[PDB]
Structure formats: structure tokens, C-alpha cells
Amino acid sequence: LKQTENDLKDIEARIKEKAGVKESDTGLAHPLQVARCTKIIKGEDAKYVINLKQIAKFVVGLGERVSPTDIEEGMRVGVDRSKYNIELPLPPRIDPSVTMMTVEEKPDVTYSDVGGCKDQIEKLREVVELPLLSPERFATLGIDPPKGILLYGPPGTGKTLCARAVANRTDATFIRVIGSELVQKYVGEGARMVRELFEMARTKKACIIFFDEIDAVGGARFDDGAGGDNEVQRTMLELITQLDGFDPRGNIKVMFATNRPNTLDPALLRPGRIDRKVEFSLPDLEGRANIFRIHSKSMSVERGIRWELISRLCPNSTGAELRSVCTEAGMFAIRARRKVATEKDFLKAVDKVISGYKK
Amino acid sequence: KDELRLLQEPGSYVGEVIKIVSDKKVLVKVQPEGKYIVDVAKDINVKDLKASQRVCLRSDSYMLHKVLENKADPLVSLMMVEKVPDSTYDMVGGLTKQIKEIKEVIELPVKHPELFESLGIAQPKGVILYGPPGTGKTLLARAVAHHTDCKFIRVSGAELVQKYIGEGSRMVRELFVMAREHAPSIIFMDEIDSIGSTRVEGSGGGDSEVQRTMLELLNQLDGFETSKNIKIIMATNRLDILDPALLRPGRIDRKIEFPPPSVAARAEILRIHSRKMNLTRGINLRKVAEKMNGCSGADVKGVCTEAGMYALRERRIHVTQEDFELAVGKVMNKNQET
Amino acid sequence: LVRDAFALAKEKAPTIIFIDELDAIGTKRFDSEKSGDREVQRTMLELLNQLDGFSSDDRVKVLAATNRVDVLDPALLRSGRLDRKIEFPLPSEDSRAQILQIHSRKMTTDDDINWQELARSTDEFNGAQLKAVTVEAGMIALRNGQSSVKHEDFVEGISEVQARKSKSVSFYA
Amino acid sequence: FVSNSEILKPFEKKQEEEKKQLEEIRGNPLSIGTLEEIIDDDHAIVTSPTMPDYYVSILSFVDKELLEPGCSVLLHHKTMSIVGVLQDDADPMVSVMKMDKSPTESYSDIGGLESQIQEIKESVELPLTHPELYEEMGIKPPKGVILYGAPGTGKTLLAKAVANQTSATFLRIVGSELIQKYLGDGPRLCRQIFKVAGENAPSIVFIDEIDAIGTKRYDSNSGGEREIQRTMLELLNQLDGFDDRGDVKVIMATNKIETLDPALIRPGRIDRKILFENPDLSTKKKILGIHTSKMNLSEDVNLETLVTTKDDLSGADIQAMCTEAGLLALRERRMQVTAEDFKQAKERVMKNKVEENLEGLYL
Amino acid sequence: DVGGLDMQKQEIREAVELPLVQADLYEQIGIDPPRGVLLYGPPGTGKTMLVKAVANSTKAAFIRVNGSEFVHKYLGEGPRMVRDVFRLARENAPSIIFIDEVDSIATKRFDAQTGSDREVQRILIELLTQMDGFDQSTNVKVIMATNRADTLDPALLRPGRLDRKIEFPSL
Amino acid sequence: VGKAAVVKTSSRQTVFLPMVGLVDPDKLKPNDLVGVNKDSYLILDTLPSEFDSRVKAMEVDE
Questions:
Q1: Three-state SS at B141
Q2: Sign of the Cα pseudo-torsion (F25, F27, F32, F35, in order)
Q3: Angle of helix B167-181 relative to helix B211-220, nearest 10 degrees?
Q4: Burial level of B42, CB count in 10 A (0-12/13-18/19+)?
Q5: Where does B52-134 have alpha helices with state H?
Q6: D27 among the known binding-site residues?
Q7: Which residues of B are less than 8 Å from D31 in CB distance?
Q8: In angstroms, how far is CA A80 from the centroid of its own chain?
Q9: CB A314 within 8 A of CB A288
Q10: Chain D within 8 Å of B294 (Cβ-Cβ)?
Q11: Interchain CB distance below 8 Å, B205 and E120
């Protein structure tokens, strides 16, 4: 097998390199990330001659032609940054972005770090849980749920597991899209990724489209709003033309996550699209107690401890600061050389968070 | 015959060897382009190419051409390494403690590194200059490299700090890579000098940014490079904008303070100029030192310049004692103001 | 776009041109930065040529709307250009009663609602913010257990019923 | 030479009529590029550092499973076809990457820090050497470590001492180089850190001297940057996504954590906070014993004499005192430092060589 | 062309004409020629028209480098351009560099400005390097005219390099 | 100067060429499509309006 594939360059690759390179490079020129043509004269109809490079840009006039399969020669055909006329039917949509997309239908997450967040659930009960369960109730109310729902709170807390808890009661599909990964070297990845989200939301009713880290995208940015390239500038079009105009409000819903509302486009913050603003508070004495008892099932502890007094000494804390109390509880047991964490280990773990941080 | 050969050459650039391939190729990094695999020349050994090896590549066929000597030569703005410049301890000297502290802090560890190694102790790689304004230690830095037969390296923070992204880093890493092979040398940094010779009194906004990308790469010489015989000459009268933690070893080791220009110290300073200057007979150089108080090195060269002005009005190549009494009277009122 | 908006003015018999957020290209402040990005400056330069194209033609109009006005341009102040300052402040108490009346007609209600009585609970709302109030007012019907939205559902929804300082401090704490 | 001649040499002798000639079919004019998309049609996308994006074909060398998008592969000059695959180290992964094997510093050379040695061991060395302590408790050991103090003492010695006992390569990453002030370079350099240390987990990640990414301020000016907001927020996903038994750790050093993003912090991921402590009496004694071993001491020099009057200088500053004592010995031309040199050295080191003076009157 | 300059007319020749022509006389004395001269007083009186008229007598290149010049938002080119001017001035001996309103350069940083202007302290690095950094030799005439200064001590003052301090008579 | 036109293509290359009778001074204007050469960048003839760079996300309602 080793010596068999060595001589294929002189036999099989001679035809492969001719049809895969010489034909593509003919005249200074199947996933297509690039296309180029130099001085091609073809009699308006299948003219093409489009240079994807920012240098020496071309246009196509003289009528309109639709050829989604093969425009002119096949081979190298592309759109990339600037969309010119009749080149729309064949966009270069290929990209290994599958690692970015995370789709979970009917998540099983109920309460882990979100114990005590039922106050925020009631905020999402009317405008999210209600339409995804009985959308026909809004017919007699006369109004309909708003398009989007805005999330607010501490950075990196409450925007992950709290969104999946609502989808459990409604048996919806939770799709998390990271906004920082929407920005790549390919111009238009943010707008193209949003296009496929509404396409999958029309097939299956009652789906949740979630956008993680919208500050990296927003409605505008430097390279798009202030720049010449179009990525986020074309992303806002998919949140307006598709969601508002074509898509009904009951079946398709949109939710974002951001640290500050001012980091977004004021055009999106206006009513008609983004209305509900959900602020993430911190769990109370009852909420912080239900989180510690769940983590105590996977961690060896003493059967005679009390999780109510553990959450009582600790003030209001985020979802991470509460998990730190259980993880640090095993560190103090190492000094005492014990297999389980006694009540005194949790008391020292709370003082480590109070004194070590003081926030 | 050499005309047709040289004039028809398309030209060749310089690149660094990354890795060697058993297929008789090599990967050479290109600055305007990037890493590109080329073919090893028939007269060049593929195994002799090491990492970061300086070689010459032809721009026509984009392959390997020749092999140069290994050294660090990035973009040079006031970074050029010189050898034994023109300076002497006689012109910038005149103080006993000033020169004596240099011998212990500089001359001993640089020339004889085995002195501190035999006792199992580290040797100072840095010094902080002190004293009132008007020292003259700037030209003294060139005397340190001239008499010790070392290489003089002047670091000017103005040329190494630019608005472009990465200039506060790359320009500092140029000194870091250069100091590896050129380690037997002497480095002198600017923009921090408060001592009064060349004094910018630091920078509030200039040292508030590049301070993070500079001091961290200087300490890596002992921690990472582990290179000796590297002398860092720094001068400041106060520590304010810089790192307060610079007092740790590896950066600030010894501190040489400029003694006050007393009568005994300035007596030999007047003997310095009198060798080059033309003087008459009956002149007391010790009495002139007693006529002033706290005369700096800048005022000594100033009063000698004033003394030469009265000699031009007399059309005499020698400066008479009467001209000194008129020159001392002017420098005292000039130094009193401000 | 200055010529593009004028290109559609040729064939179409009338025309009205609008500009959203004029302060972007209309306010130079103390900076010349219009020279830095020439799309902003040359946009204002093409307006002076297009506004002087048809002097007597009433079928070519150019308008602009923004938040505030900082930099004044007497060259732009004249007949045939933007001159008279028309301020659009926050609507008054009775001004929002007619806006909420139209929003109630677009939805399905009991038609027992008096728009004059609900205008007393509104403080500093524009035409767009009143649309969000009607959405939050219908959510009160779910808390009151009603199929439709009656007049009593608005009174509880128009006051605050969102965020603010809520119930944390009430009566005497 | 003797064994390989009778074993490995005859193996290639029978294949000399094939393996020798068939390897020359590739040629000497070959290039390098980066993969993009791989399919089963023997065609892919390759990009050289000059950005000549092309759609080429794939010669038969290894299966498509061994071709990873984003890794350097062996290409051709003219046709730009894929003739094989190469190592991914040619990728500009991290701007500053230095792998230091066998660090010199250890726990015995850092002085009286043993109070902090057993504490730092639990968060780094303990899960590497004995993960069963955290496994029997069903908890994950903290990956991150926060450092304080000054460089050369608490920000240096503590970093190189833990890598010695763990038998792991010291990997230093400059914190100020993590921000290129460009969109897309922030998350790229962060993901490549865990990639080089994530195969066999040979080394441990170390980061020191952060004056930049630690503080984003509110704006791209006044010391902060806009790319820091996206870099720190995305780096959190790499901390949760990275999972191991503790063979690889992340140790970062910063002066103040108040400017850090509470998202990237995420308590319970970082349980380790090292505060700078003043050296005790046993700290200076351990530093002297190293240098005084090779330096002959007189009869009037003892262990309790040098530690009698001290400001509790750190382990590095005590080393500077021994060097000054030897400097005075060179003035008298002798290799044995006497007791008269230490009296003049302690006055120069703590006053002349280090300016403190201990300003009083409640200050 | 202006009367009442007789006091300066003797001070101008020795600090300008002598070091660029007759400097060999200073070699007989044993001192290096003066590398410049300090001026005090507002511009317009024996400063603008006077100094520009002296360059015609000495046949030297008159270059205007002021305190409000080379002012731009790119960090580092300000001192870099200073490096290029004095480097060329070392090859050509007949050159004169006049500085008007040096107090703009002599100003130091009393506050941290963050963004905007950080360049206050950078322009002194290359100016002092070509003067206080090197030895005493005159390949060019650097004339620093001080407009208004009180507490500013850039070290440009004192007879370290420049020789005469000329103050415009107020009477 | 008067009989010659100054054109700047999308390639960041400005070419100075004398005007030809095939093109008219009113037909050559900025923000317009003027067909030129790919190699020599020489003005040939103007093109009709097709792609004007309409600046999308722009509401057009008659």
C-alpha cells in the first residue's frame, strides 16, 4: 500500500492535476473559496468575469440571468464579499463552521446553578414559555409576543443554563450560536450563519434561536459599519427582513445575551424587535441552598451536615461563586486528611470567598 | 566578464531557516512573504542548516541561493553595534570615587567573570547613575566600552516606540535577540535619564505604555537566555513612572552615585581642560575651584568657553589669568539664575 | 446616495428625500474628521449641488431628522434647503392619549377603555415607547385571568410593572 | 552502526529498486500551505502565507482522516496540489512561545515560603501527581492560578519551582503579547496555547507580567483595548472546554484582579490565589546557605549574625547582599570574605543599593 | 537692517560666523566651538529678520525647526524626523537650524494625558541625543529662542552645549 | 490637463490618459461605472447603470 500510492503521481495524478489545477488556473485563474478570471469575452448571457479579490472588481450588466447550477464554465465561481448582480444564485457557503453551531433539542437541564432563578423564569414565562406552549391564547388577547428578548446581568453568568431551563417546559429546540466565533477571515460568516437559523426554524415549529456573545457582532462594528466589508452590516438584515416581516412571531423566537445594552445598535434597541429586557439577579437564601445540595450528590460529604447554614453565611453570589464553595470544600479536607468534607470545610470555603474577594 | 554576471542577477533576499527535511528541501521564513519551502542548493549542506540560521534565497526561482554568517540584524534605528568609539577617562573624569566605582561594578565582572564565580556569588549586570545635574556621564558611557574593548550599544526609546501596533514590542525584541550573540557588549538606554547630562525627566505617557513590553524582556536575559557579560547602564535620579520593583537583582544590582563637585574634585577637572587649552604662566587652578560652589560639569566647560572668548578679543592664542577672573564672574551669575 | 435619491426623482413625478440621524454627517463639531473619511464630507458636498439643481420645482424635497442640533451652517439656511427648526420633544399628557387610542383600535379589546383616563399614568413616553406599553399591558390579562384585555388591565400595566425598584422598598422598611 | 547494518539496512536493500526511485517523483520544487476544507473527491483548498487562495486536487499520500484543516501540509510549486501532510508547528500559533525544560528553581531554594508551597501544590502538583484525592471527592481541581507580588521573587521563583517537581516543561507566554489590537487575533492565539500542550500534555502553561489584557478599561484608549473584551470573554470558553486530570495547568500573574472580567475569572475554575508574604527568619537562612557553601567565611561570621538585623528582604535581595560582601573582598584582594565586609555590606544593600530608609511617623 | 543691535552684533559673529568659518582660531585657544546660542524675548525683535540675514553672511543652510512644527498624531516620527535632520547636518558643515518658541518643546508633562498628546517628552530624546548625547563639535548652528518660560528646566539651559544667553533689552 | 482625464480604478492605481472621442465629459463622473482595461487600465467606453452600489438596509417605499 505504501509503494502503491507513491507512483500514482506519474499515472493517476497526471489526469487529476490537469483537470483540478490546469483547468482552474487556465487564463491566469466542489467547495469554492476563490474564483478568478482574466480577460474573458463571452457573448449579457453567462458573462460572469468576476474577481473575488478586492483589487480590480467587476460587475455584470445587460439584463438578468439565473443559473444556480452552472453559470458559465463552472470551475471557479464565487461571490465572497461584494455581491454583484446575477451572481447571487451560487454563493460560496462552504465553511467548517460545524464546530461553532450547537443544537440541542429539548435540553434536560432543570436546576444546577440556576436554582432559585424562578424569578427570572417568570419574566420569561409570559413572552417565551406562553407562546411556545399555547400560542392561540394571544388571539383573544389582541397582541402578540415581541420579536426578541434581551438578557442582562453579570458577564458569563445566567446566560447559559437559565435559557435551557425555559426550553424544558416548552419542549423547544435550543440553538446556541457564539458571536465571537461568528467573526472569521471569511467576510459574511455572521450574516450567512443567521440565514440558516431561520431556515431550520421554519421546518420545526416552536424553536428557540439563541445568540451568545452578541457584543462581538451587534448591529454594527468598525470593520462593517465603519468599514467597507459587509458581515455584521448584512447580519442586521436577517434579523429585520426575515424575523419581522416574513416570520410569524409565535413559532419563531429570537433571544440575545449581552453584558451592556449600549454595546448594541440603537436601531435594534428601538421597539418592534428588541423589547423584553431580562436582568439576571442573584439567588436568595433558598436559591443558594438548592444549588449546594445538588453538588453534594456528586461530592463525598458527611451525612450529618446542613446545606441551609452553608448558603446563609455566604452573601448573594453568581453561579460560579456558588460552585466555588463546593469545589474549595474538598481543598480544606486535604489539610485535615479526610475522605469527605465536613461542615467545618464548607465554613472555611465561604470565608475564603468573602475574604479572598471582598466584592 | 563580471559585468554580464552581476548586472543580470535578479537579486536575492535574506531569510531564516526553520526546519530541515529529509527530502532535500528546507523551510525558510520570508519577512515580506512568510514560511515557504525551498530547495537546498547543490553546494549547500541540508544538515548544516540549523534553526534561525541566516541564509540567502534567490528572488527569481524562490529557492535557496547562499548561506551567510549567523547574526541578528533586524531594522536598525540607532541600534548599530559599534566597537571602541572615541572617548577617554581623562576628559569626562576628574573624580576619584566616580572612576573607582566603575572599576568594581563594571571592569571586574566584565573582564574577569571568574572573580565572582570563584566565590559562588553573582556579578552585577546593571548600574544606576546618580548625582546632581551637570554630570557628563553620557560621554563616560562611551569610555566604558572603549577602554574595556567591548561593544557599545545605545538604546534610544524614541526610535523603538512608534504608534504602529507591535513597534513597542518588536523593537524591544530586536534588542533581545541581538543581545544573545552580541552579549559581550555594553547597553545604554535613553529616555529614563534624570541625572542632568541628557535629562528628559522621564515620560508620563510615553513610559505608561511600553513599560510593560520592555522591562519583561530585559529580565529574561538572566532567567531564560542565561547570558553573562551583558552590562545594562541605566540612570535616574528618582523612581516614579517606571516599575517600583526594579530594585530586585537581575535589573538593578549596583548603584554608583556622583560625588558632589567639591574643591578637591573640581581641582583636577580644571587640569583636564588646561591640557588641551592654552594657558599662561602663574595661573592657580586650585584657587579657581575655591571661587565657586557646586559647579557642575556643564559650567566648567562653560567658563572655559567664556575664557576663550576674552582671548579672541585680545588676539592671543593663550588665555591670560586676567581673562579667568572675568570668566569666573560671569559663570557665577549665570549659575545663580534659576 | 445623494445622486441615487436624485436618480429616482427624475422619473417619479414628485419626490421627498429623508435623512435619518443627520448629526452623523451634519455635525462637524470642532473636528475636521470629515476629511478623514471622505464618504461623509463628499456626501454633504453633493447636497449643495443637488439642492441648487431645481430652484423653482416643488417636486424635489430633501428632509432630515436627528436627535439635537449642534453645528449651524448658514450656507444651508435659506429658502430651498433645511432652515426652519422643528422640535419634536416628548409628547405631553393629552398628546399621548390619541396615540394610545390608535394602538387600542389595532388590537382586540372590550371597547370600554377611555383613552383620556390612561394618559394620567404615562410620564415621558414617545410614540415608539407607547407601543411597548400596550404589549406589557396585555400581559396583565394573563395575571388577572382574562381572555381579552379589559380597561382594568391597562391601569395596572401603565404604571410601572417593569423592573425599576419594585417591591424591595414599599410602605415602611 | 553494527546492529542497524544487519537489520535496518537489508530492509531497505530489497526496496532500494523502488523506495529510492519512487520518492524522487515528488521533485525538488515543492511548497507549503494551510488546509481549509477536506472532502472525499481528492480536492481541497490551500493557502500559502502570500494568500494565493486556490482550488486544487489531492494526491494519494495518506487518508483524508490525517488531513486536518488549519495545519501545514506539503504542497507543489506550480500546480499547488497536495502531495502530503507536514507538521503543524509551522503555523504562527503564539507570538512568543518558549519551552524551558528542567527549570532550575525548586521548593528548597525559595526560602521560607513552605507555608505557600503546600498550598500551591494542591492546585497544581497534587492533581498531577495524585489526582485520586480529587477523584475520590468527585471534584475538579482548579486549572488557573493567580499570582501577586513583584517579579523575580513571588512572580518568578514560585512559577519555576512548581514546574521542577512536576517534571513538566516550562512554557512561558507573555501576557502583553496576547493582545494584537486586531480583530480575530485575540481568540486565535488563545486557542493555540492549549493546542500545543493538549496532545500528550508534556508541559504546563505559564503566563507572567500582564499589564495589558488584565485591564480593558471602558475603551480602546486610556490603556484599555476593544479586542481585550472579546479575548477575555472567549478565553473563558477555552477554560471550560479544556478538561484533563491536571497534567497541564494555567498560571497567570497580574498586579490587580479588580480590572479583570468577572466572566473570565469564573470562581471554582480558579481556586488558587497567592498573596505576597513577608520573608520570615528561616527565609534568609536558606538563601545564605547556598552561597556561603562556595564562599569561605571567617571565624566571626555565623548564621545568627547575618540575620540579627534585617528588614526581611526577599530571597533575591539576600543574594545581592552576598555579592556585595564579595565585592569588598576584591578590594582587599582575597577570596575569603571576612566579618568586616558584611557590616559595610548590610548598610549599603539596604540603604545605598536599595533606597527605603523606612519613612516613619505613621507611614 | 535694524539699529540698536550693536550689543548683539558682537555676540552674533563670535557665536555664528566664527564657529562656521574662523573656528580654527578656537583650536589655537584649545576649546571646542560653540554649538549654538540661546535667545530670550518675544519673536519679531532681532530674531526673525535678523537671524535669517546672518545666514547670508556665513553662507550656510538655514533650516526652520520650531516648537510647534513636526506636530502630528503618529507617535515616534516627531523624534525620528529630528534624527534625520541632524544626521544630514553632520555631513554639511554650513547649516543653521533655528528654533522659534522653544518653550513648546521645553514644556514637560505635569499630567497623564492617556490618549491624545503623549508626545511632550518624546521630542526631547533625539534633540538632546544630538546635543547632550555626543561630544562638543559644531557641524550645524542650533539657535534656541525662548519665548516664555519660568519653571521649565529641560536641561537645554546652562552652558552645557550652547554658549551665549541673549536677552532682548526691555529698555 | 483640459483634454486629458484622471481616472482611479478599484485597484488603488491612478492612470493619467488623454480623453478619447468615444467618451464624453458628461458621461465621466465619480461614483459611476466606466469600463477600463484590466492590465493597462485605459478608459474605453462608459457603461449603463446596473449596479450603482445601492447601499442596502435602505428603505425604499413608493
A1: helix
A2: negative
A3: 20
A4: exposed
A5: 96-102, 108-111, 114-118
A6: no
A7: 36-37
A8: 22
A9: yes
A10: no
A11: yes
Residue for cell digits 439576571? A280
Distance CA A19, CA D42 (A): 12
Query: Which of F31, F58, F60 lies at the smallest CB-CB distance from C3?
Result: F31
3-class DSSP state of D82: strand
Q: Which residues 259-278 in chain B show a CB within 8 A of chain E?
A: 273, 276-278
Give how far the C-alpha of residue D180 lies from the chain's centroid of Cα atoms, to the nearest Å: 19
In contact, B315 and E25? CB cutoff 8 Å:
no
Which D-chain residues 297-356 have CB contacts (< 8 A) with chain A? none
What is the DSSP track for A202-254?
Answer: HHSSSEEEEEE-GGGTSS--TTTTSSSS-SHHHHHHIIIIIIIIIS-TTTEEE
C99's grid cell:
396615540
Tell which E residues from 90 to 119 touch D, by Cβ distance under 8 Å. 114-115
Q: What is the DSSP string of D191-214?
A: HHHHHHSSSS--EEEEEE-BSSTT
Identify all chain D residues contacting E114, using CB atoms and an 8 Å cutoff.
221-223
C-alpha cell at E136: 562638543
- Give the DSSP H or E segment for D251: strand D250-253
Annotated resolution, angstroms: 7.5
> What would the grid cell of residue F58 be?
435602505
For residue D45 the three cell numbers come to 483548498
Contact C128 A126 (CB under 8 A): no
With contacts defined as CB-CB under 8 Å, which chain A residues touch D116? none
Contact D196, D155 (CB under 8 A): no
Q: Which amino acid is at C74?
A: P
Going through chain B in order, the beta strands assigned E by DSSP cover 12-21, 25-29, 35-39, 53-58, 63-67, 82-83, 126-129, 151-155, 185-189, 230-235, 254-256
Sheet holding D30-38, edge to edge: D54-57, D43-47, D30-38, D72-76
CB nearest to C135's CB, from A140, A143, A226: A143
Those of residues 100-129 in E touching chain B at CB distance below 8 A are: 108-109, 111-114, 117-122, 124-126, 128-129
Q: Quick check: D172 contacting B, CB < 8 Å?
A: yes
- Own/partner long-range contacts of D124-128 (Cβ < 8 Å, ≥24 apart): D124/D162, D124/D166, D124/D204, D124/D246, D124/D249, D124/D251, D124/D272, D125/D162, D125/D165, D125/D166, D126/A334, D126/D246, D127/D245, D127/D246, D128/D166, D128/D168, D128/D245, D128/D246, D128/D247, D128/D249
* CA-based nearest distance B308→chain E, Å: 6
Closest among D196, A294, D74 to A310, alpha carbons compared: A294
- Spatial CB neighbours of A291, under 8 Å, sequence gap ≥ 6: A111, A112, A113, A115, A116, A283, A311, A319, A322, A323
**Structural biology method used:** cryo-EM
Q: Is A42 annotated as a binding residue?
A: no
Confirm if C160 and C135 have CB atoms less than 8 A apart.
no
Gap sites in chain D (C to N > 2.5 Å), preceding residue numbers: none
Nine-digit cell string for B7: 548586472
Tell me which H or E stretch contains D186.
Answer: helix D185-196
